[PDB]
């Protein structure tokens, strides 16, 4: 149950994209 919030609700990667998204594309 854990290694699934450590995975989002804790890291959230939906964030960590949308900032290595740009230096990553531009």
């Known amino acids: 149950k854990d290694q699934?919030?450590?995975a989002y609700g804790?890291?959230?990667g939906?964030?960590?994209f949308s900032l290595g998204?740009?230096?990553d594309k531009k």
């Open 4 to 6: 699934f919030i450590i």
């Open 10 to 12: 804790g890291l959230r």
């Open 14 to 16: 939906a964030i960590a």
């Open 21 to 23: 998204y740009l230096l």
